[PDB]
Design a protein around this ligand. Structure first.
Ligand SMILES: [Ca+2]
Ligand SMILES: [Ca+2]
Ligand SMILES: [Ca+2]
Ligand SMILES: [Cl-]
Ligand SMILES: [Zn+2]
Ligand SMILES: [Zn+2]
Length: 168
């Protein structure tokens, strides 16, 4: 695994998130579920906990965007860059943006929102890209397939635990 330079990490174990808006690709319950599952994946192996805010300022602001969307890194239309997320810190840091020129799916027929969100939340928490080819943190989107038995790599486990420790 890898962290970001100077190892930026959250300095508190309880993090808030807010889902700022919703793709037309999917029912709202399926967006909420995928994001929840993505946070749980990391919760499970650290002493991090998350709660959802519906108003005010959250640590991890999650949004769907196309092209220019208010930072310096515009999205690129269909495929290629699917999403991007900033390392821990105040303001835009921690936040995760999802390119809505993808077709976001609950399954594997378009782009799987759960898998990409798990990977992006990894960045929100302080993990950079892994050299490991089976790691969730491996850069490249590999259509699983079959997300039935998805489990974090050890490597991802080693990375995140090296930042926040194992569950208490
Ligand atoms: Ca933030
Ligand atoms: Ca794209
Ligand atoms: Ca879309
Ligand atoms: Cl927010
Ligand atoms: Zn962005
Ligand atoms: Zn990545």
């Amino acid at each position: 695994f890898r962290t970001f330079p100077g190892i930026p990490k959250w300095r508190k174990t309880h993090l808030t998130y807010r889902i700022v808006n919703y793709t037309p690709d999917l029912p709202k319950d399926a967006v909420d579920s995928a994001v929840e599952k993505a946070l749980k994946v990391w919760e499970e192996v650290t002493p991090l906990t998350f709660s959802r805010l519906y108003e005010g300022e959250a640590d991890i602001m999650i949004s769907f965007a196309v092209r220019e969307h208010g930072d310096f890194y515009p999205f690129d239309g269909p495929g290629n860059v699917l999403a991007h997320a900033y390392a821990p810190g105040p303001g835009i840091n921690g936040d995760a943006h999802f390119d809505d020129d993808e077709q976001w799916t609950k399954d594997t027929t378009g782009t799987n929102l759960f898998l990409v969100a798990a990977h992006e939340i990894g960045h929100s928490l302080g993990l950079f890209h892994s050299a490991n080819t089976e790691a969730l943190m491996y850069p490249l989107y590999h259509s699983l397939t079959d997300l039935t038995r998805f489990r974090l790599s050890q490597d991802d486990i080693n990375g995140i635990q090296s930042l926040y420790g194992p569950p208490p």
